[PDB]
Amino acid sequence: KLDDQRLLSEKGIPKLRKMAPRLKFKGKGHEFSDTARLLSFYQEWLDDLFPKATFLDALAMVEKAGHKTTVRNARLKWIDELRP
Amino acid sequence: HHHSAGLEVLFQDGEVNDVVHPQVRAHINSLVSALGGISIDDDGGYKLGDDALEVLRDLKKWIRFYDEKTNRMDVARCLAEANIVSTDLLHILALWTPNENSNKYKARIALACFELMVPLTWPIEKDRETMTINHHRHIPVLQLAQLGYKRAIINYDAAPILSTAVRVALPAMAMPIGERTARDQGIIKLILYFLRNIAMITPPPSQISRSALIDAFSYQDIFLTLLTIASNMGEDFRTEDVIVMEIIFHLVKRVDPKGQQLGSFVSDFLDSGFNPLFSHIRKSLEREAPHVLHYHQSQFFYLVAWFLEAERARRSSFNLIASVLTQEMFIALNRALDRAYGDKDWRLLTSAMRCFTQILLTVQEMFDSGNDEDQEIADNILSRLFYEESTHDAVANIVRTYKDQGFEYLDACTELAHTFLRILEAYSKQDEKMAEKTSQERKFDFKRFAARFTPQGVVDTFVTFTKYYRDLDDSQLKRAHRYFYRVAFKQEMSVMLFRLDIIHLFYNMIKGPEPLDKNSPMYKEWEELVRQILKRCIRKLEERPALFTEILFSKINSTAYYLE
């Protein structure tokens, strides 16, 4: 799909492996403030990917795109980086 | 503006045409006037018409041969505007007093009133092939007219109409089933359908109309009549089993099974007319009877579920509901579950799932019951249920596959999924080497069974149910709480629960736009729950950096095990 091509283009996903440990915004004592910083981090990324879209409506479009055969092969690349 | 506007006057009667056939309106009005009228003399009463019996028979002919045969609704609308079922027919039935039941003429005119009242108060279904442009025009008026009929019948000061209805069928009800003719069996059907019709009438989408119905039913001894037909469902009765069931179904409509207004009836019904009535309906559905209809199947499952909850509010004897706990019922509902899913019938499945939930809640209360025979039967039912994989794989697939099926269906499947896990968990626990081999083997089988509720499909269905937290009650919140609590306490590490959309909901549920009310008893349990899930969420991101990219939830059970 042309609308789901934003994930295929590899512009958003390489920033999810580079910007996530970069912020280091983690506190073990707090659950709410840490998850609020996490939600604000993804809300920023979703607005840059495609603006003028509802937050809840955007998240559901990402998971539906993930089920695709082309996307599944690309996702299996990220899990291999963990293995020694 | 200083002076009045001339357009303030409205529009105006024979000179202006109506939606009905102009000659029908004249003919129907010739009949409604000829049947009688109120006496001009003070305390005179109601003057019955001279040819009242024949005009009533002529009005019945106008319904069957003009409205029904030609697919029209003109005579129906004419009688609605005349409001005879509220202004004329009620006064005629008032004349036939309990001491005057011997009057043949007064009993025949009373029957002719119900032979007219039944088709007029009959429920209408908009979605039909037979329906034309004519039907669709009149239906909104007739539906409102039917509410006006019910109101007048329930609140009639002069005479008890519902008690008068029972008296019409009563002599043909006394004679044996073999001795009853086709005419005599028709009077029982007509009177039973009249009681169902008035109980059916509700405004299309007030609680006083629901209360007044129960109050009129008990006072005019209709609940006593319903009990006598239901308790003798074997001998003297047959076919009427579904008609009586429908009356009680429209009575228990949006009624709580515990601490109700009809508390006097519920105890008497379970003691006399539960097993003979519900065993007959079960046998009627199995043999594929001609009198039974498709909608009667889902109504049956609703009433079984309703009366099982009503039984646990009293729990005088768990033997009074023995007919619905038989293995014959189990085979029947399991075949009904497979058939309803295939035919894509969700309303039938909703009632079947809710019925099955109440059966499982009953066997659990029979396991802790004081009766020695009750614990014996509860354990032999649970023994089969713990190993019957045919039932297991079917229930698990329903909760896994959910898409635009409605909240009523969602509340029914999550009710069954939560109870099935909870009841089997109790069985999973309860010379030394021989006894342990058979006792500890059930713990292996339960972890295999609980693994059916772990996939993404079952998770998402419970997540979408949790979304309605603002409207969910204390018991409804317990189901969602105990499911997610079962995910972390499964050693699963809630890998399935880790998804942006799922994490979003849990946060704003406690701290966000909808605070779920801090004073609620379920809030404190949920606040402790969400914090425990989010604690493992932050920890798993540090443990594995792949979780940041695999937060999509599009994963399966094999990739989730890699993460934990």
How many residues are present in chain A?
84
Distances (CA, A) of B211 to B214, B248, B260, B429: 6, 14, 11, 46
B320 CB contacts (<8 Å, ≥6 apart)? B270, B271, B274, B275, B311
- What is the b/e burial string over B253-263, where b = at least 16 CB atoms within 10 angstroms of the residue's CB? eeeebeeeebe
**B503 with A39: Cβ contact below 8 A:** yes
**Cited resolution, angstroms:** 3.1
Distances (CA, A) of B281 to B265, B273, B358: 20, 12, 18
Q: Beta strands B46-48 and B36-38: pairing type?
A: antiparallel
**B538 with A28: Cβ contact below 8 A:** yes
How many residues are present in chain B?
564
**B550 with A75: Cβ contact below 8 A:** yes
- Residue A71 sits in which domain range? 5-80
Measure in Å the smallest separation between the Cα of B456 and chain A Cα atoms. Answer: 12
Environment class of B125 (CB within 10 Å of its CB; exposed 0-12, middle 13-18, buried 19+): exposed
B48 beta partners: B36
A77 interfaces chain B, CB cutoff of 8 Å: no
Residue B517: strand, helix, or coil: coil
List alpha helices for B451-510, DSSP H: 456-466, 474-488, 500-510
**Of the candidates B302, B276, B432, which has an alpha carbon nearest to the alpha carbon of residue B357?**
B302
Chain B residues with CB inside 8 Å of A21's CB?
A: 545
Number of domains in chain A: 1
B427 interfaces chain A, CB cutoff of 8 Å: no
Residue B545: strand, helix, or coil: helix
* Orientation angle between helical segments B222-231 and B263-272, nearest 10 degrees: 10
Distance CA A59, CA B460 (A): 14
* Orientation angle between helical segments B327-342 and B275-286, nearest 10 degrees: 50
B544 interfaces chain A, CB cutoff of 8 Å: yes
Least CB–CB distance from A63: residue in B534, B548, B552 = B552
B508 interfaces chain A, CB cutoff of 8 Å: no
Distance CA B76, CA B286 (A): 38
B14 CB contacts (<8 Å, ≥6 apart)? none
**Phi, psi for residue B127 in degrees, rounded to 5:** -85, 90
- What is the b/e burial string over B377-406, where b = at least 16 CB atoms within 10 angstroms of the residue's CB? bbeebbeebbeeeebbeebbebbbebeebe
A74 interfaces chain B, CB cutoff of 8 Å: no
Q: Do B218 and B262 contact (CB within 8 A), yes or no?
A: yes
**A79 with B546: Cβ contact below 8 A:** yes
Interface test with A, best of B459, B538, B556 (most A CBs within 10 A): B538
Joined together, the tokens standing for residue B304 give 């079984």
Q: What is the 3-state secondary structure (H, E, C) of B275-309?
A: HHHHHHHHHHHHCCCCCCCHHHHHHHHHHHHHHHH
Distance CA A11, CA A19 (A): 12
**A35 with B544: Cβ contact below 8 A:** no
Q: Do B306 and B252 contact (CB within 8 A), yes or no?
A: yes
Interface test with A, best of B500, B514, B535 (most A CBs within 10 A): B500
**Phi, psi for residue B494 in degrees, rounded to 5:** 50, 45
List alpha helices for chain A, DSSP H: 5-8, 13-18, 20-23, 32-49, 55-66, 69-80
**A26 with B541: Cβ contact below 8 A:** yes
**Displacement of CA B453 from its chain's centroid (Å):** 28
**Phi, psi for residue B37 in degrees, rounded to 5:** 180, 160
- What is the b/e burial string over B264-290, where b = at least 16 CB atoms within 10 angstroms of the residue's CB? ebbbbbbebbbbbbbbbbbebbeeebe
DSSP annotation of B203 reads -
B530 interfaces chain A, CB cutoff of 8 Å: yes
**Displacement of CA B18 from its chain's centroid (Å):** 39
A52 CB contacts (<8 Å, ≥6 apart)? none
DSSP string, B306-345: HHHHHHTTT-S-TTTTGGGSSHHHHHHHHHHHHHHHHTT-
A56 interfaces chain B, CB cutoff of 8 Å: yes
